[PDB]
């Protein structure tokens, strides 16, 4: 099995950990958002939300995130924030 | 083939002695007898009897050509 495709493994592993770092980064901001949600402070949560807003978009446009999930997160949270308003 | 016999049914030597005889020589005799012959047995009159069953059937079965 002497093939040049063996480079596609090491190349992909570089991309694997790269997206991996980007993935948990998103979850952290969600937990940052959910933190204030546990507290109930709307302004703090609003601050938490407005800080990750520009981040999720630059990850949505980067190709790692499809538009749907990006739009979905902005929906549920903000509506729930109105509950904690 | 070490043929071993043990005799315990008696008190004296001579009786345990003679009992060992038949337990050996007769046991030798019984283990030597075998089947012999007679096979096969041939039909004597069936070779005559069956003739009727064939000719009676052949003669009667002649109702064919139309």
């Amino acid at each position: 099995n002497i093939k040049s495709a063996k480079k596609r493994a090491i190349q992909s592993e570089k991309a694997r950990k790269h997206n991996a770092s980007r993935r948990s980064m998103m979850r952290t901001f969600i937990k940052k958002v959910y933190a204030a949600i546990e507290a109930g402070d709307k302004a703090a949560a609003q601050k938490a939300f407005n800080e990750m807003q520009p981040i999720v978009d630059r990850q949505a446009a980067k190709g790692l995130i499809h538009k749907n999930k990006a739009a979905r997160h902005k929906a549920n949270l903000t509506a729930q924030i109105n509950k904690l308003a | 083939g070490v043929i071993v016999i043990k005799a315990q049914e008696y008190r004296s030597q001579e009786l345990n002695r003679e009992a060992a005889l038949a337990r050996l020589v007769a046991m030798i005799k019984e283990l030597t007898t075998e089947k012999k012959a007679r096979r096969p047995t041939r039909p004597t009159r069936a070779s005559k009897e069956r003739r009727l069953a064939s000719k009676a059937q052949k003669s009667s079965v002649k109702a064919m050509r139309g």
Partner: protein, 123 residues
Amino acid sequence: ATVNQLVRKPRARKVAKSNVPALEACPQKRGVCTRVYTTTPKKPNSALRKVCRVRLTNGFEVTSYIGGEGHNLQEHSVILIRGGRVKDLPGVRYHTVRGALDCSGVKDRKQARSKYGVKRPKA
């Protein structure tokens, strides 16, 4: 014909049984062919039909007829089997093909040479 239960229970078509349990889809089978002997036909006949017990490659043990006026079988020397009854020996349902793997064809035959596996004498 009381079509009501016909819908409840359709016309149960009987399954077509076999005649050669040697092995379906397999026209022929090889066997070690042990036990070489001869028996006697049924009531209407009188002869000495030579037969053999055959252990199949399928694990089965069948009895077949040795067709010919001269054989060279030795309780071994694998042969080939085929379907076909004789209506003379109750129990047999297979024929043994002369001119087989390890069983020569009959010697000194002229007619039906395609049968008995005997090669046509061109000389």
